[PDB]
Design an enzyme around this catalytic site. Structure first.
Site, mmCIF file in Angstrom:
data_model
loop_
_atom_site.group_PDB
_atom_site.id
_atom_site.type_symbol
_atom_site.label_atom_id
_atom_site.label_comp_id
_atom_site.label_asym_id
_atom_site.label_seq_id
_atom_site.Cartn_x
_atom_site.Cartn_y
_atom_site.Cartn_z
ATOM 1 N N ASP A 1 -4.298 39.823 -20.414
ATOM 2 C CA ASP A 1 -5.441 39.398 -19.613
ATOM 3 C C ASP A 1 -6.412 38.696 -20.556
ATOM 4 O O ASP A 1 -7.242 39.321 -21.220
ATOM 5 C CB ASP A 1 -6.054 40.596 -18.911
ATOM 6 C CG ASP A 1 -7.252 40.240 -18.043
ATOM 7 O OD1 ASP A 1 -7.743 41.154 -17.340
ATOM 8 O OD2 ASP A 1 -7.705 39.084 -18.065
ATOM 9 N N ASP B 1 -5.752 45.380 -9.072
ATOM 10 C CA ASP B 1 -6.311 44.116 -8.608
ATOM 11 C C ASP B 1 -5.765 42.915 -9.383
ATOM 12 O O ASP B 1 -6.115 41.777 -9.046
ATOM 13 C CB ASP B 1 -7.859 44.122 -8.640
ATOM 14 C CG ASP B 1 -8.435 44.483 -9.998
ATOM 15 O OD1 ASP B 1 -9.665 44.280 -10.206
ATOM 16 O OD2 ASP B 1 -7.672 44.988 -10.848
ATOM 17 N N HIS B 2 -4.929 43.135 -10.407
ATOM 18 C CA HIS B 2 -4.072 42.096 -10.969
ATOM 19 C C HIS B 2 -2.643 42.393 -10.539
ATOM 20 O O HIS B 2 -2.287 43.559 -10.331
ATOM 21 C CB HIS B 2 -4.098 42.042 -12.510
ATOM 22 C CG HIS B 2 -5.442 41.769 -13.118
ATOM 23 N ND1 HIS B 2 -5.674 40.690 -13.943
ATOM 24 C CD2 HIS B 2 -6.601 42.470 -13.089
ATOM 25 C CE1 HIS B 2 -6.926 40.718 -14.368
ATOM 26 N NE2 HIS B 2 -7.510 41.790 -13.867
ATOM 27 N N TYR C 1 -6.404 42.471 -24.001
ATOM 28 C CA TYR C 1 -7.340 42.593 -22.884
ATOM 29 C C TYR C 1 -8.678 42.022 -23.371
ATOM 30 O O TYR C 1 -9.446 42.705 -24.050
ATOM 31 C CB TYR C 1 -7.475 44.049 -22.421
ATOM 32 C CG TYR C 1 -8.545 44.210 -21.368
ATOM 33 C CD1 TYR C 1 -9.641 45.023 -21.575
ATOM 34 C CD2 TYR C 1 -8.467 43.497 -20.165
ATOM 35 C CE1 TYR C 1 -10.636 45.138 -20.597
ATOM 36 C CE2 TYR C 1 -9.442 43.596 -19.204
ATOM 37 C CZ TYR C 1 -10.524 44.411 -19.415
ATOM 38 O OH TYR C 1 -11.484 44.501 -18.428
ATOM 39 N N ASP D 1 -5.575 48.143 -13.966
ATOM 40 C CA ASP D 1 -6.826 48.615 -13.377
ATOM 41 C C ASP D 1 -6.857 50.135 -13.304
ATOM 42 O O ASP D 1 -7.058 50.729 -12.240
ATOM 43 C CB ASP D 1 -7.046 48.005 -11.990
ATOM 44 C CG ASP D 1 -8.433 48.335 -11.403
ATOM 45 O OD1 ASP D 1 -8.541 48.433 -10.156
ATOM 46 O OD2 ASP D 1 -9.403 48.496 -12.190
ATOM 47 N N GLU E 1 -6.230 47.311 -19.552
ATOM 48 C CA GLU E 1 -7.232 48.122 -18.854
ATOM 49 C C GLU E 1 -6.641 49.445 -18.368
ATOM 50 O O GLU E 1 -6.714 49.796 -17.186
ATOM 51 C CB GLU E 1 -7.870 47.347 -17.702
ATOM 52 C CG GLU E 1 -9.354 47.128 -17.953
ATOM 53 C CD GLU E 1 -10.122 46.487 -16.799
ATOM 54 O OE1 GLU E 1 -11.296 46.874 -16.600
ATOM 55 O OE2 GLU E 1 -9.588 45.567 -16.141
ATOM 56 N N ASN F 1 -8.673 36.790 -19.575
ATOM 57 C CA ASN F 1 -9.965 36.808 -18.877
ATOM 58 C C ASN F 1 -10.647 35.441 -18.888
ATOM 59 O O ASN F 1 -11.824 35.301 -19.228
ATOM 60 C CB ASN F 1 -10.893 37.885 -19.451
ATOM 61 C CG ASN F 1 -12.003 38.263 -18.485
ATOM 62 O OD1 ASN F 1 -13.185 38.065 -18.773
ATOM 63 N ND2 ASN F 1 -11.631 38.796 -17.332
ATOM 64 N N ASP G 1 -4.013 36.065 -16.327
ATOM 65 C CA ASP G 1 -2.961 36.700 -17.106
ATOM 66 C C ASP G 1 -1.927 35.655 -17.507
ATOM 67 O O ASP G 1 -1.434 34.907 -16.656
ATOM 68 C CB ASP G 1 -2.351 37.843 -16.292
ATOM 69 C CG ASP G 1 -3.412 38.891 -15.904
ATOM 70 O OD1 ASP G 1 -3.631 39.837 -16.706
ATOM 71 O OD2 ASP G 1 -4.063 38.741 -14.834
HETATM 72 MN MN LIG Z 1 -10.367 44.798 -14.208
#
Ligand SMILES: [Mn+2]
Length: 276
Positions: free
Chosen positions: A168, A266-267, A129, A28, A54, A170, A241
């Site tokens: 990630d 935030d991960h 990502y 992040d 990210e 997602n 993840d």
């Molecule tokens: Mn993010």
DNA sequence: CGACGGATCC
DNA sequence: GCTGATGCGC
DNA sequence: GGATCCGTCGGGCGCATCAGC
């Protein structure tokens, strides 16, 4: 509802000690993550390879601390082409890979600094990502095109060399992979198209979800919590993840960890142990 | 994207 | 050439 | 009234640009 990752299993099912430790972390924002001491955690975790997602940071602006990583010398970076400050991925490696490439071999999907491919002797590592489908699902259609092209790319890769895909992706594959499944069925990351995408990836390559392979019935194991709702303190999260492995790497699988306690994004980090 | 409130059914 | 306000992408 | 289902929407990060000094 809260979750405590079980201790590290460091030998394979046939007793072979782990030889490879890979750590993946959506940070992040690489520069902020470093300000929040993220690299102190990395040093304590001591991975052989570190994948970052990210980063939101171009190669020209990488902090200097990254040059003070004695055991993670070979550093590869990818940033979006259109504009700065979003997406971005990194791969740092104790030993030099035989070959590093970028993207998935498709122009439409190779502009946003999302994929790094590092080939080693006995396996190939991909870190990704995955593009977000967006509030309002404005990018859902694009995300479906991404899913199919990513899948074809990885299937070809795995047919040439055993594959580790981390990062990630997602998407929360199944209801067990997020805390609020019924409230999120139309939100980016848990649409039926994205979950079907994930499922086809597992089947078509084929790949195995390393964590779910080892802990098929464990709920509340997440790798992301939204920053606004202070959802992390109450473990209201998503498993976004993953480490996905070629089936030929399953006898080498020692563990696949969720480092819930490591702050800075935030991960949280995830860590793979392989006995190669 | 979780908190919230409204709508529908019992 | 610096800083705050504002917008984008999560 | 409660219980289930859904649709709306506010809130906040890390990053960028740029309009204002
Ligand atoms: Mn993010």
């Amino acid at each position: 509802a809260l979750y405590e990752d079980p201790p590290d299993q460091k030998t394979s099912p046939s007793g072979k000690p782990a030889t490879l430790k890979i750590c993946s972390w959506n940070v992040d924002g690489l520069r902020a993550w470093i300000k929040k001491k993220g690299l102190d955690w990395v040093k304590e975790e001591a991975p052989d390879i570190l994948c970052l997602q990210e980063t939101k940071c171009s190669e020209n602006k990488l902090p200097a601390e990254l040059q003070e990583l004695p055991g993670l010398s070979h550093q590869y970076w990818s940033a979006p082409s259109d504009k700065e400050g979003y997406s971005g991925v990194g791969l740092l490696s104790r030993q030099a890979p035989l070959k590093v490439s970028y993207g998935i071999g498709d122009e439409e999907h190779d502009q946003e600094g999302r994929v790094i491919v590092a080939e080693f002797d006995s396996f190939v590592l991909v870190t990704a990502y995955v593009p977000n489908a967006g509030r309002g699902l404005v990018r859902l259609e694009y995300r479906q095109r991404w899913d199919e092209a990513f899948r074809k790319f990885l299937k070809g890769l795995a047919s040439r060399k055993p594959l580790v895909l981390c990062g990630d992706l997602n998407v929360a594959h199944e209801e067990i992979d997020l805390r609020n499944p019924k409230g999120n069925k139309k939100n980016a990351g848990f649409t039926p198209q994205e979950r079907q995408g994930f499922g086809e990836l597992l089947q078509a390559v084929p790949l195995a979800d390393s964590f779910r392979h080892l802990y098929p019935n464990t709920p509340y194991a997440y790798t992301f919590w939204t920053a606004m709702m202070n959802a992390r303190s109450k473990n209201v999260g998503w498993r976004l993840d993953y480490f996905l492995l070629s089936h030929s790497l399953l006898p080498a699988l020692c563990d696949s960890k969720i480092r819930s306690k490591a702050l800075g994004s935030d991960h949280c980090p995830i860590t793979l142990y392989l006995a190669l």
